[PDB]
């Protein structure tokens, strides 16, 4: 870094901070002050690139040029993650007493450097993000090559791996101490990324939609009770729909809404999407060089009461899934398709028969996006799979509920109570009926109240 006299920086609260592409990067608190800017232009003789910064941060950088940090770094007992954060912090405070003899509580930065989508594409490129409501937006955070490289190693290391020119790409996961995960892709140097090192982070912050979404008019309360029932006696279900229609949300809703506290559930996804407020649950994610089938195949092997497959896309796993259904597990999954030849076609084309899928698949929901100019509507367009037929067209399907878009209503279309009878005894069937008519927005609380 270089300015004119240190006094001038302090008086005008501006600080040069680099020189790139023949221009002097100048951090400036008052970029509307043409007198100060023209003074810097004349005194340096350099073309400027102005960057706005908070006044006190500029002043701080002027005086520092990160010292108290340059020493607290040489304290191995700090970076050590084996130590609980509660104590580690204490050391940093007491060690900081060295300079002025207090305890500072909560050094924001000293902590910030020791203890839903983030896109970090290259050197001196402003980070972009995906906001829960605003979506793709630009950000006031940029890192030049040195800072990029440092972030990049930081994230790499906290995820447990060692990125280098020898191993320039890295696809790991950060475990936030709050048990929360995040998927991190990352690249060092420019060997695979000419635009420099770079990282992306898909945060698992979801807040999964609940059955509270009969608010959103998607599924009627009656149907949700029927599914609640259905999922308790282990009727297997697939959620089908075009893209952007609701499949995963709806699925996650149905599992989340049930009390799954007394059953071992058991999920295989290509990446995390499923949030469940339940204890007996094993979540399995595809890793390098594993097929979906490896994880399902070895998982069905233990004893899951319920199996959730994020979405069937290699049908060698599909096959394991419908096999799991014919044992009598409760299997659930998602499939990209828009109606019945869509799925069945789609399911049959890696070698499961409709006797095995349709015979052991119980219910198939079909999800949609309807909009009417600017309403964005996701509805369950419609399906009870009765079975197979000997000498046939096969897939015997009884459509319980259709959705009329003209009135935005869910109609019952020839379903009778005698259909959903499929129960092992009279008491079981009675329980289903009660849940039929007898059977708070957050998932944690909703699960909490279906639990009861």
């Amino acid at each position: 870094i270089k300015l004119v006299p240190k006094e001038v920086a302090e008086k005008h609260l501006v600080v040069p901070v680099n020189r790139a592409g023949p221009s002097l990067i100048v951090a400036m608190c008052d970029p509307s002050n043409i007198f100060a800017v023209d003074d810097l232009k004349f005194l340096t003789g350099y073309n400027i690139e102005t960057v706005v910064a908070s006044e006190v941060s500029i002043r701080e950088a002027i005086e520092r040029y990160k010292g108290p940090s340059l020493e607290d770094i040489v304290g191995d007992v700090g970076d050590d993650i084996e130590v609980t954060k509660e104590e580690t912090e204490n050391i940093d405070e007491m060690a900081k007493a060295a300079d002025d003899a207090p305890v500072v509580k909560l050094v924001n930065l000293i902590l910030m450097d020791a203890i839903s989508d983030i896109h970090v594409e290259p050197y001196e490129k402003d980070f972009r993000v995906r906001f829960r409501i605003d979506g793709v937006m630009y950000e006031v955070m940029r890192p030049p090559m040195k800072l990029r490289n440092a972030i990049t190693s930081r994230l790499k290391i906290m995820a447990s791996l060692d990125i280098s020119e020898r191993r320039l790409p890295q696809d790991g996961r950060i475990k936030i101490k709050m048990g929360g995960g995040k998927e991190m892709d990352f690249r060092v140097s420019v060997c695979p990324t000419l635009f420099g090192e770079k990282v992306v982070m898909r945060l698992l912050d979801k807040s999964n939609l609940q059955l509270d979404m009969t608010k959103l008019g998607f599924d009627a309360q009656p149907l949700a009770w029927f599914k609640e029932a259905i999922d308790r006696p282990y009727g297997m279900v697939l959620v089908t729909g075009p893209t952007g229609s609701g499949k995963t949300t709806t699925l996650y809703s149905a599992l989340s809404s049930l009390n799954g506290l007394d059953t071992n559930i058991c999920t295989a996804e290509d990446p995390v999407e499923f949030n469940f407020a339940g204890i007996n649950q094993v979540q399995m994610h595809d890793d390098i060089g594993l097929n979906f089938a490896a994880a399902l195949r070895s998982f069905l092997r233990q004893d899951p009461d319920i199996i959730m497959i994020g979405e069937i896309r290699d049908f060698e796993t599909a096959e394991i899934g419908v096999k799991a259904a014919l044992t009598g597990h409760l299997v659930l999954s998602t499939l990209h398709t828009n109606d019945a030849p869509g799925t069945v076609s789609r399911l049959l084309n890696m070698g499961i028969e409709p006797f095995l899928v349709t015979a052991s698949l119980n219910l198939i929901l079909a999800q949609r996006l309807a909009r009417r100019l600017c309403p964005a509507c996701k509805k369950p367009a419609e399906c009870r799979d009765c079975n197979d037929r000997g000498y046939r067209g096969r897939v015997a399907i009884y459509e319980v509920m259709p959705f009329w878009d003209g009135l935005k209503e869910l109609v019952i279309n020839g379903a009778s109570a005698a259909e959903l009878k499929q129960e092992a005894i009279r008491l079981g069937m009675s329980s289903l009926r009660m849940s039929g008519l007898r059977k708070a927005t957050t998932l944690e609380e909703v699960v909490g109240n279906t639990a009861p």
Partner: protein, 314 residues
Amino acid sequence: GFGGVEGKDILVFTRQFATMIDAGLPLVQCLDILASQMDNPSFKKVLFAIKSKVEQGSTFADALKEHPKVFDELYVQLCAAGEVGGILDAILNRLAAYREKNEKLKSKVKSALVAIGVTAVLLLKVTPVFEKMFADFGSELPGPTQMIVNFSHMAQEYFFHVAGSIVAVVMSFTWSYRQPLFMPVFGPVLRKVAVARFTRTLGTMISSGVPILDALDVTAKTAGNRTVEDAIIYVRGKIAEGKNIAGPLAETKVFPSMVVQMIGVGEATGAMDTMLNKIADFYDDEVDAAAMIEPVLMVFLGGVVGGFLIGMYL
């Protein structure tokens, strides 16, 4: 107070950087690779710190400035001269050759003012001092004169011994200076050094993640011996045509049966990086063992001393 690093260890690391940088890898990725391939911690540890400064955007010369006890002012200035002129690749090659000559010259005084300078004064006059001191035990030795002669005649008769001392000097200087028609049959071919360098360079670029063919195209431009360069161009041409790496090597005498057989395993195992790293370490240690540069010293050391003493006695 901090010390530098060994002559061996500067050597290995300057060679392997020159090699990676001349390959067109990014400087930070070059730095990462040599750190990650290092056997001593102090090297892997520094090179992570030099790389940490380079990723903040500093020059390599300014990043090495964090270790002035290891990379002296003359080294950094060579780097910085390369960075200022757009020749970082060719100044690192120069520095690698420099570090190699420095380590070889070190082993080779010491074997059997730094240490080399102090030991080389000290060996060059040890004997001739012995000599002057036996010839100063009194008067009327073998070959002397009585002290009453005129000085000029006394000094001229002893000229024998003044001569046997100078010859003793010239000899120990020669040992310290040396010691650190079928026309094609007469050309210098690949040596042990040149195979060790090749193997280290390839072990280095493979461990970093470069493919075999990218590593060979870089290496075929950075090989010093012309006959080996011709060999390696033929190996790369064979591999690029779809022949198996161990089979291109097996055509050339410089690769032993064990080298080829070991490489031939590495092909089927996806472990060539490391097969090459272990081959290279084996060779580098065979090189530094290769011992006649110290026995022949001592032959001329005491042999000349004894020739002086015999000379005047007679």
